[PDB]
Design a binder for this molecule. Sequence first.
Ligand SMILES: *[C@@H]1O[C@H](CO)[C@@H](O)[C@H](O)[C@H]1NC(C)=O
Ligand SMILES: *[C@@H]1O[C@H](CO)[C@@H](O)[C@H](O)[C@H]1NC(C)=O
Ligand SMILES: *[C@@H]1O[C@H](CO)[C@@H](O)[C@H](O)[C@H]1NC(C)=O
Ligand SMILES: *[C@@H]1O[C@H](CO)[C@@H](O)[C@H](O)[C@H]1NC(C)=O
Lengths: 50, 22, 595, 99
Amino acid sequence: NTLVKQLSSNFGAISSVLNDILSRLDPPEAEVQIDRLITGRLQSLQTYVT
Amino acid sequence: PSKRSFIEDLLFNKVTFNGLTV
Amino acid sequence: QCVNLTTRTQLPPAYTNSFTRGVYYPDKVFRSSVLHSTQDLFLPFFSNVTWFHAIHVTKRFDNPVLPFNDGVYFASTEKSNIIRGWIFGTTLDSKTQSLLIVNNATNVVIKVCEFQFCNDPFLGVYYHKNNKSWMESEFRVYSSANNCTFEYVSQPFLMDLEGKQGNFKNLREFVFKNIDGYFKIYSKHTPINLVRDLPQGFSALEPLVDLPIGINITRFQTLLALHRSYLTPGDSSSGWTAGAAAYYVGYLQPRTFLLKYNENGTITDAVDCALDPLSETKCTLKSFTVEKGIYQTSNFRVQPTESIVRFPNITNLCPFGEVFNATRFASVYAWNRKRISNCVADYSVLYNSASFSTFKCYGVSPTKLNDLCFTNVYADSFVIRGDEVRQIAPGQTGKIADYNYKLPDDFTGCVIAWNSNNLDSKVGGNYNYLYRLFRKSNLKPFERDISTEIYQAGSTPCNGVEGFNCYFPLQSYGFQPTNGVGYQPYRVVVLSFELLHAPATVCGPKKSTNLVKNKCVNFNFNGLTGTGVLTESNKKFLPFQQFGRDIADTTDAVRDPQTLEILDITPCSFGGVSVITPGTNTSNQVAVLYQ
Amino acid sequence: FELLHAPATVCGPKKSTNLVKNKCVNFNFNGLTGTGVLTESNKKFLPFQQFGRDIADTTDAVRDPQTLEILDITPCSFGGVSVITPGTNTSNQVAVLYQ
Ligand SMILES: *[C@@H]1O[C@H](CO)[C@@H](O)[C@H](O)[C@H]1NC(C)=O
Ligand SMILES: *[C@@H]1O[C@H](CO)[C@@H](O)[C@H](O)[C@H]1NC(C)=O
Ligand SMILES: *[C@@H]1O[C@H](CO)[C@@H](O)[C@H](O)[C@H]1NC(C)=O
Ligand SMILES: *[C@@H]1O[C@H](CO)[C@@H](O)[C@H](O)[C@H]1NC(C)=O
């Protein structure tokens, strides 16, 4: 349940959903927010696995 | 339907999507 | 046109299938007794390669243009060197720079010239009886060349110039490519003995050269050697009896291989990483032998087919011209507010009628404004000096920005600034444009300050005297045509909006389509995006709600903006793909389990 | 002259140095930056190969571009130091150990 609920946090981005990021904004200026989201989700996965 | 005994049945009745396969 | 040829027996293109054919060295490094897994462009195993013929037999002779995608596996087979050269380029118009490679008796020439080719170029050779040699008869491949930014000539040599017939005693393979401007080539020769369709086995191709040319290539051709003799009629249109010739043409794809470097550093075997489940398990294990058991491989996913779009029925246009210099704007201190809604808008009006010099957005890419659906767009009207046009920005300072009109940091919208010098260049000067020079404290974002009292700089309470330390922050401008460009007025409009709050009808010119059910398809509901299957549910939405949500805080159910029904959303299909194998040693048949 | 069209093919010259052997030395073999003790090797490359890798995308050999020779690459020494003390209370002698 916690691993699922981690999928709705911004981690610093302007929104917590990737589709909105890729639809509202141009990818060369969206790669940074995508990187933020990827870092957050990687941290969550590592915690759960350990 | 199965071959479980009585006490096994009592024990059986007393215990209660992004890629999360089981 | 130019000279042509007759008696061309048109036939459907013969087809044949390669067998582990056309694998070249990916790069320059050296490895010994490893199993590397490279990722480059390769000819797929057991692909479909198009046969071509030029052998007269009868009346067969063909060498037409072929498209040139990202690589071609040209694998000719010859006995008397009937196929000699090549042509590259974009349209062969003698106007776009093009490449050429001829195998002449002098050299294997490489040229980069705007050559003007005819519709039937070739290489001509004749069997003169006085001297039984093979000289060129008509080297009119091209008209001339104007500009040539690259030329090269190789070493001289002398071809054997055979005029005989027989089975193709040798074999030739080439893989032409084109990356990052550079032009490459690969080759390998083997005197294989056969008479017919390409043989079995596996062999590797070695690099030859790397041309540093910068042309763009789309479509290519091929030279042939016409074996003209006395028995021919004796003309460029009908006098020719070429003889045996055969060559195939393959196409590359972004595949993924697993090559097996042997002890010497050569390549002895290769396995395609996506042909069949056993090969996938070999690729995953990084080995050529698979032990008995069950393994894991890539996942299974259903691919969407159709895309649907829904939008509310709105026809009224969005009034923009009456906001863009209708009659007059207001001063900086008292800016102008306007709310626009319930209309279909567009951005092209901000790109065609007047290309405003200052046009920079925030949060939203300027070219993407069609699709995302807006909510209660806000507009601002005011004119400032050209010196401080940068003052209007999310996170800047300045007198007017910090004292007259301040943007929030999370502002989501575009800003437009464009000079109107003729409208605001009075010889006497228009002086209704003011500013707030001083204020005791800063203001709030999107908050007005209409106070125009006598500001008290220090002590001596003013009480309407405007004495020392009592100044008037509202001061006029000096807009005259004689003023400098930096001080010239700019007209600035701020386009502010917010999104994803409630059902709005302000967004752009997209068009609707029919609605489908019970299929894994894409969708777009008032700017929403995703993928799933749309069924009909039994939820009872209260007659003010729009969305539905799960415990994971995502979209579960939506509402059709036109039919007012209630639809459902469900992911298409997940699941891994296991593979059951008895062992590569034992057999080579597998069973696949979708989980 | 121009720039940024058909990536540079007309370009300036490059310098050269000597070739030392059997000593730790930073090297630059046609752009291959590294560090180690170059020594004569016996691996047989192919006429068109320059680099050399073994199991983990690491350099193991390099072709001497001028003489078309093969030179190995062995990294320099490692190893932390260890101090064997019999106790400050007892004496003040040590015996270091290079690992
Ligand atoms: C591709 O070829 C066309 C020919 O019209 C040329 O205009 C274009 O610049 C080429 N593209 C590249 C990336 O070289
Ligand atoms: C290459 O491999 C073959 C094995 O077929 C071996 O006989 C030969 O000696 C090897 N080449 C060299 C230079 O060792
Ligand atoms: C394959 O199985 C047979 C029968 O057990 C055995 O003789 C042979 O050595 C096996 N081969 C390999 C490569 O394991
Ligand atoms: C040092 O050793 C002596 C003799 O065993 C002992 O009496 C003393 O307490 C020790 N001191 C410390 C600091 O270990």
